[PDB]
Design a protein around this ligand. Structure first.
Ligand code: PLX
Lengths: 70, 57
């Protein structure tokens, strides 16, 4: 009676544990991958991250400058 | 038979017909470095959320 009205079967806890373990393992793998990607992006500068501004080339004036040699 | 040019005439911007070829790289520039890959796509929700310590969202 106690088992029938207060508890469930073993398979429920078993499969809930499986799902929880899958989620946690995926999160750990993602954390490691994110750290490695951050290291590579900061070292190389070839990714979307750690982009530091340079002078906009639209500010340059392309006209004759009263002197032939610029 | 020379006629003196009038006011505002010697400061005109004229056109020149020359056979000298137009220089292609007068600045002697090198090759510009290639731009960054410029990733693009559809945004999907973050996998398992923020993934910050114990937060599940
Ligand atoms: C002959 C008898 C011998 C044995 C006597 C047994 C005595 C039993 C008292 C001990 C109770 C144990 C505590 C249980 C509370 C937690 C369990 C909880 O999960 O059960 C809930 C049920 O809650 C219970 O109703 C709690 C009972 C607590 C009340 C105790 C009775 C006496 C208290 C006195 C109250 C005040 C009296 C008035 C004074 C003026 C339903 O939760 P649920 O997630 O669905 O379960 C899923 C499993 N399913 C599928 C089977 C449903």
């Amino acid at each position: 009676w106690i088992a029938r009205t207060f508890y469930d079967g073993p398979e429920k806890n078993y499969e809930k544990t499986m799902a929880i373990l899958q989620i946690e393992a995926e999160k750990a793998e993602l954390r490691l991958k994110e750290l490695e990607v951050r290291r590579l992006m900061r070292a190389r500068g070839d990714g979307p991250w750690y982009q530091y501004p340079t002078i906009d080339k639209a500010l340059i004036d392309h006209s004759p400058k009263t002197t032939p040699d610029n | 038979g020379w006629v003196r040019p009038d006011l505002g005439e010697l400061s005109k911007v004229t056109k020149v017909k020359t056979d000298r070829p137009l220089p292609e790289n007068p600045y002697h520039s090198r090759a510009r470095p290639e731009p960054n890959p410029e990733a693009e796509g559809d945004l999907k929700p973050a996998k398992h959320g923020s993934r910050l310590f114990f937060w599940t969202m």
